[PDB]
Amino acid sequence: SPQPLEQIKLSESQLSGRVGMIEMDLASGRTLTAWRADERFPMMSTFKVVLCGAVLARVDAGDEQLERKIHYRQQDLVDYSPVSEKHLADGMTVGELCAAAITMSDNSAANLLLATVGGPAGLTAFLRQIGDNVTRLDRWETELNEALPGDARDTTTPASMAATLRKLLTSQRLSARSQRQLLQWMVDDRVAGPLIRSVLPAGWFIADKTGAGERGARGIVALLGPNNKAERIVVIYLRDTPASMAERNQQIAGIGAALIEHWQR
Ligand SMILES: OC[C@H]1O[C@H](O[C@H]2[C@H](O)[C@@H](O)[C@H](OCCCCCCC3CCCCC3)O[C@@H]2CO)[C@H](O)[C@@H](O)[C@@H]1O
C-alpha cells in the first residue's frame, strides 16, 4: 500500500531484523529499488538455482549430461530429502536432482549435485569465473543454513544474487535450451510457487526459489511482472529476527504488495 522503500523500512522495524532487497529490470539490469543491496545475507536453499546453473554450464561444455544417472547410499542422505530418499535403489539423473533441489528443495539432491561441480569451492570458482566476486559457498547441506551472525560463509548480497541470476537467464553464457530449463525449474517450484500464485492478482507471472535458516533467516529470489511476462527480478533476504515464520512470510508478501501497487517507476 505504501511506497515499496517505505514499506521495506516498516517490515525491518516490525521484524526487529535486517532486510536486504533489490528490484532489478531483467532485460537491461537497471536497479529500480534497493535496500541493504550491498550487505551480506545467508543464501540458504536459494543457492540451488545458481548451483543448477553451473550444472547446465557443464552439460553445455559436454562435461555433464542431464540424463546421467547418479547412484547414492542411504548414508549419503541428510535431513529433508522428500524425493531422493525414494530412489536409493534406482538412483536419479542429474536433471532430476536439479528438479528435486529447486522445486521440492531436497537437501540431499543439492549435495549430490554439489559433488559434480567440485564442492562449494568448485561452485564459488564458477561464480568468480562468471563475474560474481562476492557470493561464496563454503559448506554443504545443511551446515550452510546455520546463519551465524557476522559470518560471511555461504552468503551473498541482494545486488550480487540478482546480477548473477540475470547473467544465467539472459547472457549467452548458457545455451538457449539450458536457460529454458533453469527458468522452467523455477516456475515449477512446488514449495511456495502455487501459494504465491494463489494471492497474486490475475495476469502476474511468477517463478521463484525461496530459503529459510536459523535466527529467522528467510529469503526469496523471484521473476515477477504484469501481462503474464517476467519483467523484473526481485531478491529479498531476512536475517537475525525472532519473528514466527508466518509473520516473516507476511512481511515479504507485504513488500511484494507494495511492488505490485506501485509497479510503474
Ligand atoms: O490494484 C491492483 C490489484 O490490487 C489487489 O491485488 C493485491 C492482492 O489482493 C494481494 O493478494 C496481493 O498480495 C501480495 C502477495 C505478495 C506475494 C509476493 C511474494 C514475493 C514474490 C517475489 C518477490 C516479491 C514478493 O497484493 C495485491 C496488490 O495490493 C487486488 O486484489 C487486485 O484486484 C488488483 O489487481
Side-chain angles (χ1 to χ4, degrees):
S1 265
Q3 240 110 131
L5 190 63
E6 259 60 73
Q7 166 61 226
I8 266 150
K9 272 175 219 187
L10 216 97
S11 272
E12 188 169 282
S13 97
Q14 273 195 217
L15 236 41
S16 273
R18 210 85 68 60
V19 184
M21 178 261 184
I22 173 97
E23 161 176 56
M24 172 170 102
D25 200 84
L26 178 63
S28 72
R30 175 162 56 96
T31 276
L32 282 96
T33 289
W35 172 253
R36 292 197 197 272
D38 294 318
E39 281 188 50
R40 274 206 195 257
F41 285 90
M43 269 196 292
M44 289 168 301
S45 245
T46 75
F47 90 88
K48 270 165 206 198
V49 279
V50 146
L51 152 63
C52 273
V55 180
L56 291 161
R58 283 187 91 221
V59 155
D60 271 3
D63 280 338
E64 181 61 281
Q65 309 118 242
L66 248 40
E67 272 112 339
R68 196 180 67 136
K69 179 79 73 140
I70 279 150
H71 276 271
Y72 47 93
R73 272 337 305 125
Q74 184 157 345
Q75 312 120 48
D76 287 320
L77 298 182
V78 302
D79 176 38
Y80 200 66
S81 294
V83 34
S84 71
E85 79 167 58
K86 310 258 135 270
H87 289 103
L88 273 177
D90 44 35
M92 278 180 80
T93 67
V94 176
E96 273 196 291
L97 277 172
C98 255
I102 287 157
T103 81
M104 285 308 262
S105 210
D106 196 295
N107 284 324
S108 241
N111 261 26
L112 255 18
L113 276 171
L114 248 171
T116 61
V117 298
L123 176 69
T124 288
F126 167 70
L127 280 172
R128 299 296 182 257
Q129 188 173 101
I130 239 78
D132 190 324
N133 291 317
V134 180
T135 297
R136 51 182 291 200
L137 218 235
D138 292 274
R139 278 121 58 164
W140 293 75
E141 290 278 25
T142 59
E143 287 80 74
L144 58 89
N145 294 307
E146 172 160 67
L148 232 49
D151 193 16
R153 268 191 308 178
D154 305 296
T155 65
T156 190
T157 67
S160 255
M161 181 50 71
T164 272
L165 234 302
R166 176 126 128 42
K167 273 195 218 177
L168 241 36
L169 281 173
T170 78
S171 211
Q172 226 26 76
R173 158 87 218 169
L174 224 63
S175 78
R177 206 187 169 221
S178 271
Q179 272 186 356
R180 278 211 257 261
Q181 172 69 95
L182 177 60
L183 215 325
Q184 183 52 47
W185 275 337
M186 272 190 100
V187 358
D188 270 8
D189 167 47
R190 251 130 273 225
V191 169
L195 173 57
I196 283 164
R197 268 197 197 89
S198 150
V199 300
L200 265 193
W204 275 89
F205 168 103
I206 183 69
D208 74 84
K209 179 47 187 155
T210 62
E214 272 117 272
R215 284 171 265 283
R218 172 118 265 250
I220 189 190
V221 170
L223 256 68
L224 185 78
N227 300 335
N228 275 279
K229 92 221 142 24
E231 204 193 312
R232 269 175 208 169
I233 277 175
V234 173
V235 165
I236 302 154
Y237 276 127
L238 248 67
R239 94 176 295 195
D240 294 324
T241 183
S244 71
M245 179 79 105
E247 264 153 303
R248 260 131 99 218
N249 277 357
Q250 272 162 40
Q251 274 326 156
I252 288 179
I255 292 168
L259 271 198
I260 282 168
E261 242 186 67
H262 295 270
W263 190 256
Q264 257 130 78
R265 248 359 276 189

